[PDB]
Design a protein around this nucleic acid. Structure first.
Ligand SMILES: [Mg+2]
Ligand SMILES: [Mg+2]
Ligand SMILES: [Mg+2]
Ligand SMILES: [Mg+2]
Ligand SMILES: [Mg+2]
Lengths: 151, 91, 63, 152, 131, 96, 188
RNA sequence: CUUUUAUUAAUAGACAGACACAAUCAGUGUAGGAAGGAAAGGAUUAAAACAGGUCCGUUAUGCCCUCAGACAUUUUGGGCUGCACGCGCAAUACAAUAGAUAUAUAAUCUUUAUGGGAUAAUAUUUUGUAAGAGAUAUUUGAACUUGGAAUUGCUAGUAAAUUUUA
């Protein structure tokens, strides 16, 4: 009879140990996870072939397994390498995109090696000074200027 | 010795009430009974728009667009005015 | 439509002078269209000669 | 011969140059576009004003072709730049060619007849305007706007 | 030059289907997921834009004398925000219109700077198709 | 033979005209008169040699008048007039 | 063939029921799209010859982020009047003139004095001041009811003019006129 | 001196001219006109005063101080920009009168934090003897839901908003 709207949905989904949830589109609901932004969320779903205008509550579990492999292995599905965060990274040398649990663990590990080398651009990031060419006369008084994450 | 006025930086802080409590959710899915109740009521109603039916049947406006589009695919009501701002469904 | 019965109809004659806290009110001479009379009263807005002013109470006076 | 008059009407920076010519069908062309399919409806509505105040019987069999222009000095990559200003220019110049044709190759007693109607409708349909942008003076950002001062 | 006699949105809506069905054009490798220029924010919402833009560019060369590659980028520019400071004007991407300019010379609708007679009898069907 | 007049004041370019128009047009050959619109230089400058008082600006200017003749003639018919009609303050660069 | 409102309504068949207000109530200027281009009508001491529809859209482009837009005003007034026409089966211009009359305040007070001893006096209102005060009231309740709500600008215009003309007291400008007519009465 | 109407492009055109409002000098209203009341906007600019600013613009200058690793001049690095904190002038914002996309009303989406862009990482790259300097791809995404006492500017194409050369 009527098929432009699904019969029933779901609310909360568990993917990569974050609670992506809601009656949102697959482009907007996948923007909850860090490491995945609004450009790359639309870029991955066109390769898997699932339509963007589909609410994530109604979805088949076989479609979920392609999603788990694509974000984990982004060079297999056919993404060009320009979308990655670590393009030619110093620790390895090959292109890889970061997902939350390895993402934070790689970032703080980069911060520790600058403490032993006393890299003056790097150690100001830890206490919270502005590393770029800003003038600190009459701006940013009570605030801190390190690396910032939500929650 | 005319006037001596001093102010503090403690006065410039704002006072606000904490938060307003959250509201219950609207429905986002179509039921079989929701299919029937929209078609009988729209045939009575003369000028129909998007906000009007969601304010009745508690529906979000994203699912109410297709309910108006499905009704005009039948010969019940017709879109009588359209601009970039607002479309008007009438008879 | 019930707000229309309260009006009384009256015609201004001429302007006398301006008087107010900052000179925003004017004094006028006005006669009633129902019966022959002569009233003096202050009005807020700017008027010219020959206007017809709507008023609620017709019995109050100035000075 | 083919009788033709050409009249100009202009605004702040806009220019309009119509041309009347005699054809059996009543037609109005704005950049070789029929006027009934114009997108800028304000430009369409002002021509729709003059088509109704004088009768279409009097404007029976004439052709008008209209070119537009904007003077140099400024360059604008934005859309919606010269919408209103060109519409008042073509409203002015088109009304000029109507009384122009009735004065040269038609009876003169009919010329002042429709002239009185539009002049009672609007005196400024046939004459240009004076108002422009006032130049900026130093010490402020605008013409009359002065910079905000503070003493404490 | 009777393209003025019809609208612009209806001339594109019919001609873009046959521009798909010709199947004589090459396309860039990732034209599905990219921005049209650096001034734009996101990728276009339409599933097809490489054909509809080719219908749009055929309006301009028909109404005008000659259309180069640099004149195409200026008509499709954008006004993007650079931050707290006010906006600035950018132009379109020169690489995407290059393949668009190459495909129509690979087909034969246009030559060196003008149009061919072959594309002219295609458009003359279209104007009488709408009316 | 494009020949031009470039001056600094209006009064000098006027008296050179009716002397040249009678001598060149009425006697030998035809010509064309052509006057160009003026070109203005603008140097907005601040007045005081300090930054103390109320800041005022001044605009200086310099104007150039241009009148050009376009003549096609025989060889010595124009060149006799250069030696004859040389006026005192004005420049007249002649391009044969 | 005569000039119509939007080629759908007519400048005729409307009439002002109030006698005092009818002089500055203008109907002579006819516009398919309400737009003005005369220097002579603008630069004038008198405000009698001004179109009411021209005065109504000028109360739309109000805030500083929204100033300078007449195209966005002309669209939302068109989608407004079509809903008023079908719902009421009236001329939509007829409910307009009943909206100005009912929401127009009748008399107001004046405060002369200072301090805890302040004299209050009740005076009357000129018809030129009654019109200008009435238009400013109506646009305010529109901008309040449509600021942070899913009602479009076209929707909130329609039920505002229908409730104010019908004296149904659930509108905005009728409630604000209720207290100011009460204040001038008790101060007398 | 600039803008506006006309036409031989350097010349006309406006005078409160006309009528009315009881005198002279005026002021206001209607009519004809491109322009009606200093046509609109600028520039020039009395006597006289200030212990106002300027010896860090001057091969303008009096007195004083300094005399060859000079209180001269040249070369290489570092500064004028630093960070607990008070103040003035400004640019984006707190969103459906909106955002993305586009054929710019083809069509579609977001129906409340997809508004907002600070801070920061990786990678390509421009100028320069020399980058914590400008530009590009992807990610991270703060405060902020209209602001206490108080106070600045503005009467017509003015305020306000969006663009544009040197
Ligand atoms: Mg001193
Ligand atoms: Mg030394
Ligand atoms: Mg020295
Ligand atoms: Mg600025
Ligand atoms: Mg955004």
């Amino acid at each position: 009879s009527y098929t432009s709207d699904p019969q029933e949905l779901q609310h909360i989904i568990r993917i990569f140990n974050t609670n992506v949830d809601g009656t949102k589109r697959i482009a907007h609901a996948l923007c909850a996870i860090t490491g995945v932004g609004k450009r790359i969320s639309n870029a991955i779903c066109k390769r898997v072939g699932v339509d963007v205008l589909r609410r994530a509550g109604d979805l088949n579990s076989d479609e979920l397994e392609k999603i788990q492999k694509a974000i984990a292995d982004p060079t297999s599905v056919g993404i060009p390498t320009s979308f990655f965060n670590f393009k030619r990274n110093p620790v390895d040398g090959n292109d890889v995109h970061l997902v939350s649990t390895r993402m934070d663990a790689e970032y703080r590990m980069m911060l520790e090696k600058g403490k032993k080398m006393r890299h003056v651009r790097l150690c100001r990031v830890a206490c919270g000074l502005k590393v770029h060419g800003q003038r600190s006369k009459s701006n940013g008084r009570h605030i801190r200027a390190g690396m910032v994450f939500r929650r | 010795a005319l006037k001596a006025a001093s102010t503090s930086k403690k006065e410039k802080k704002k006072w606000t009430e904490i938060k307003k409590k959250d509201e219950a959710r609207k429905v986002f899915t179509v039921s079989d009974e929701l299919l029937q109740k929209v078609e009988k009521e729209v045939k009575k109603m003369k000028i129909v728009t998007i906000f009007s039916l969601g304010s009745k049947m508690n529906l979000t406006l994203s699912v109410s667009k297709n309910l108006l589009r499905h009704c005009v695919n039948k010969g019940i009501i017709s879109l009588i005015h359209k601009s970039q701002q607002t479309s008007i469904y009438g008879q | 439509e019930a707000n229309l019965q309260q009006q009384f109809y009256c015609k201004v004659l001429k302007t006398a002078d301006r008087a107010g806290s900052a000179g925003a009110l004017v004094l006028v001479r006005v006669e009633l269209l129902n019966n022959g009379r002569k009233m003096n009263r202050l009005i807020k807005g700017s008027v010219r000669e020959g206007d017809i002013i709507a008023l609620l109470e017709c019995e109050r006076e100035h000075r | 011969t083919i009788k033709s008059v050409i009249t100009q009407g202009k605004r702040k920076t806009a220019l309009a140059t119509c041309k009347c010519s005699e054809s059996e069908e009543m037609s109005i062309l704005v950049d070789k576009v029929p006027y009934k399919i114009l997108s800028n409806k304000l430009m369409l509505s002002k021509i729709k004003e003059i088509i109704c105040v004088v009768d279409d019987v009097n404007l029976k069999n004439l052709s008008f072709q209209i070119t537009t222009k904007i003077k140099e000095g400024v360059v604008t990559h934005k859309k919606g730049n010269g919408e209103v200003a060109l519409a008042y220019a073509v409203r002015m110049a088109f009304a000029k060619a109507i009384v122009a044709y009735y004065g040269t190759y038609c009876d003169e007693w009919k010329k002042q007849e429709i002239k009185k109607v539009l002049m009672s409708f609007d005196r400024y349909c046939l004459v240009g305007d004076i108002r422009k942008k006032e130049p900026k003076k130093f010490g402020g950002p605008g013409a009359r706007a002065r910079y905000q001062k503070s003493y404490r | 030059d009777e393209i003025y006699t019809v609208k612009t949105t209806d001339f594109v809506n019919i001609l873009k289907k046959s521009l798909q069905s010709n199947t004589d054009i090459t396309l860039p490798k990732d034209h599905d997921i990219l921005k049209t220029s650096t001034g734009k924010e996101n990728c276009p919402v339409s599933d097809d834009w490489y054909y509809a833009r080719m219908a749009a560019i055929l309006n301009l060369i028909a109404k005008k004398g000659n259309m180069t590659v640099e004149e195409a980028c200026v008509e499709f520019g954008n006004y993007k925000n650079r931050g707290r400071r006010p906006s600035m004007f950018v132009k379109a991407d020169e690489m995407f219109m290059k393949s668009i300019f190459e495909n129509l010379e690979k087909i034969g609708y246009l030559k060196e700077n003008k149009l061919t007679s072959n594309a002219k009898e295609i458009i003359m069907d279209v104007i009488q198709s709408l009316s | 033979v494009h020949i031009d007049i470039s001056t600094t004041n209006k009064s000098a370019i006027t008296l050179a005209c009716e002397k040249f128009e009678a001598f060149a047009e009425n006697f030998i050959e035809s010509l064309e008169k052509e006057v160009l619109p003026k070109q203005v230089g603008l140097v907005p400058t601040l007045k005081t040699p300090c930054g103390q008082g109320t800041k005022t600006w001044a605009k200086y200017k310099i104007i150039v008048h241009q009148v050009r003749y376009v003549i096609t003639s025989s060889h010595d018919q124009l060149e006799k007039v250069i030696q004859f009609l040389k006026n005192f303050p004005e420049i007249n660069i002649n391009l044969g | 063939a005569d000039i119509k409102l939007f080629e759908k309504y007519s400048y005729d068949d409307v009439n002002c029921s109030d006698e005092s207000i009818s002089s500055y109530i203008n109907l002579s200027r006819r516009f398919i799209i309400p737009h003005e281009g005369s220097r002579a009508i603008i630069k004038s001491k008198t405000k009698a010859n001004l179109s009411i529809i021209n005065r109504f859209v000028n109360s739309l482009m109000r805030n500083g982020r929204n100033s300078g837009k007449k195209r966005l005003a002309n669209v939302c007034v068109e989608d407004a009047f079509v809903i008023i026409n079908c719902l009421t089966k009236k001329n939509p211009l007829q409910v307009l003139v009943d909206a100005i009359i009912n929401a127009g305040p009748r008399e107001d007070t004046a405060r002369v004095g200072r301090g805890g001893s302040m004299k209050r006096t009740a005076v009357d209102v000129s018809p030129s001041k009654r019109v200008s005060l009435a238009i400013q009231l109506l646009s305010n309740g529109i901008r309040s009811s449509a600021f942070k709500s899913r009602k479009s600008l076209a929707e909130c215009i329609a039920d505002e003019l229908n409730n104010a003309a019908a004296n149904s007291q659930n509108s905005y400008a009728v409630k604000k006129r209720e207290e100011i007519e009460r204040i001038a009465k008790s101060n007398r």
